[PDB]
Each structure stands twice: as structure tokens, then as C-alpha cells.
């Protein structure tokens, strides 16, 4: 597959209840491997995949140190945002940050990320050249100017091209037995009458990994979008994913419909029909 490390931070201010809560989650591809939560009982970077659990005390000490540092920065950012947006210290606000690195086929950085949101909206994002920023508004333009003056794209690009990819390769090597897998979906078609004249055909894909999948319905070989419903891809609970797509069909016409499934764990796209 094509591999990726990504962290997702959320800070949420809560005046009247102490410092903002900070939550960080780390992923290799679609596998969460670490977490930091400032509201955990002994806040530290905690393992969430067995393979990383074997990293020695240095890993946990430094990771915790950096997570706490990230937490503090987000506390400063929350305060700063109150200034930029003319807001009260007494209201609750949210910062979300995602950053990470995609490992290319040549072992080089294919694509890097560093993007944030304030109260659910774009704030500032690093462009794909990893050398420029997109600010969503006039408040974020303050940050842009700052980061342009302090050479932050350059510093963060060095991490993305160097250390980020080094960690990703280590993790991939260490947790190889479980991370470098492509589990194909278990697939099937079910049938559920709506009335005596209409029925729902539902095409299921279960137990697949990674989360990327394509599921479509055809009628007489034509892509159907009318009377169609595709649910958001959803976790199994066990590190797998699921999705379904349904079509509402006239009774008697069921056998004119095929479901089509594409996934990296499949040697060739699947074609399914209702097999009662």
C-alpha cells in the first residue's frame, strides 16, 4: 500500500472548569497507534496498538514531552485567537490540527500536511509546495505573516521530509505483521421489502482494511445514483472497516441490478447480484 503517518489534535477551552482539554491521536494509515489526553488519569503518551507498546521509556518520555508542548502551544493559540477575533475569555472554543507525511514509492516524501481549524472552520493550512500558507481569513493572515517571518514552513518541511518519514518507516517495520496488510472485504447482497411493490437491495462490505473502498450500484450496467443510499465508511471496532450501499428497486426488477466493489485487498473488482 501507500503509507502515511498523521496526528490529529483537538483542544477545547472550558472556562469555569480549568485549562483547555487537549487530545492527540496518532495514526499509521488507518490504524491508531497512540493517544494523549490531558484528562486521562496520568496524562502521558499511551500506546494504542500492541507493537508500539514495546518502545522503551525514552520514547514515552519524549512523546509525552512533545504532546504536552503541543498542548501548551494550543493553549497559547486559544488565547491568541481570542485577541484576533475579539472574543471573551468566558466562552468555549475549539482548535483542531492535522499534520503528517505520505511516504512515496521512491522512499521520499510524496505529500505533507499541516492544517488547522478554529471553531470548525479553516484557519491556516500549509500548501502542497510545503513552502507557502493559505490563511482562511484576516485573523489567520496575522499568523501567516508571523510564520513567513520566522521561516516556519522551512522548519516544518524538514521534519516532514526527515524525522516524520523516519518514524513512519520505523513503525511500519516494527508493526509490519499488522500494518502492512490489505484485508479484502467480505461482501454480500441482502434484500428488504419496502412495500409490496418496492424492495431495498443492500450491498455490504465488511472486515476490510485500509478504509479506502468503492461501492456502487448499476442497473442494466448503468451507474445508478437515483434512489441510492451509501453510508459513511464505519469502523468495525477491531481495526476493520465496513460500508454499505443500498438501492430501492421495483419488485420484479431485482436481477437487473449489480453491485460493484473495488478495494486494494482485492485482485480484481467484484460484481455482485442478489443470490437468494
Amino acid at each position: 500500500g501507500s503509507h502515511s503517518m498523521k496526528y490529529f489534535y483537538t483542544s477545547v477551552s472550558r472556562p469555569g472548569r480549568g485549562e483547555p482539554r487537549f487530545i492527540s491521536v496518532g495514526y499509521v494509515d488507518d490504524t491508531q497507534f497512540v493517544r494523549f489526553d490531558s484528562d486521562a488519569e496520568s496524562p502521558r503518551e499511551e500506546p494504542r496498538a500492541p507493537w508500539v507498546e514495546q518502545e522503551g521509556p525514552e520514547y514515552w518520555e519524549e512523546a509525552t514531552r512533545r504532546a504536552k508542548e503541543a498542548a501548551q502551544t494550543h493553549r497559547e493559540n486559544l488565547r491568541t485567537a481570542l485577541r484576533y477575533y475579539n472574543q471573551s475569555e468566558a466562552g468555549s472554543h475549539t482548535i483542531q490540527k492535522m499534520y503528517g507525511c505520505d511516504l512515496g514509492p521512491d522512499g521520499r516524501l510524496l505529500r505533507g500536511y499541516h492544517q488547522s481549524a478554529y471553531d470548525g472552520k479553516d484557519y491556516i493550512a500549509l500548501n502542497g509546495d510545503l513552502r507557502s500558507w493559505t490563511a482562511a481569513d484576516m485573523a489567520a493572515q496575522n499568523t501567516q505573516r508571523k510564520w513567513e517571518g520566522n521561516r516556519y514552513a522551512e522548519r516544518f518541511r524538514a521534519y516532514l521530509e526527515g524525522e516524520c518519514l523516519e518514524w513512519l518507516r520505523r513503525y511500519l517495520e516494527n508493526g509490519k505483521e499488522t500494518l502492512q496488510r490489505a484485508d479484502p472485504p467480505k461482501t454480500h447482497v441482502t434484500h428488504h421489502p419496502v412495500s409490496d411493490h418496492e424492495a431495498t437491495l443492500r450491498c455490504w462490505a465488511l472486515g476490510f482494511y485500509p478504509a479506502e473502498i468503492t461501492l456502487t450500484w448499476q442497473r442494466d450496467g448503468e451507474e445508478q445514483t437515483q434512489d441510492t443510499e451509501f453510508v459513511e465508511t464505519r469502523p468495525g471496532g477491531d481495526g476493520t472497516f465496513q460500508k454499505w450501499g443500498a438501492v430501492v428497486v421495483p419488485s420484479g426488477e431485482e436481477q437487473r441490478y449489480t453491485c460493484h466493489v473495488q478495494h486494494e485487498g482485492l485482485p480484481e473488482p467484484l460484481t455482485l447480484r442478489w443470490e437468494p
Binding site: 496526528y7 512523546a63 508542548e69 497559547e76 484557519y123 516556519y152 516524520c164
Partner: peptide, 9 residues
């Protein structure tokens, strides 16, 4: 692991 880098808003 997180990056030692981080700049402010």
C-alpha cells in the same frame, strides 16, 4: 512521534 517543532498563532 510528534515533531519537536511548533510555532504559535
Amino acid at each position: 512521534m510528534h515533531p519537536a517543532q511548533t510555532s504559535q498563532w
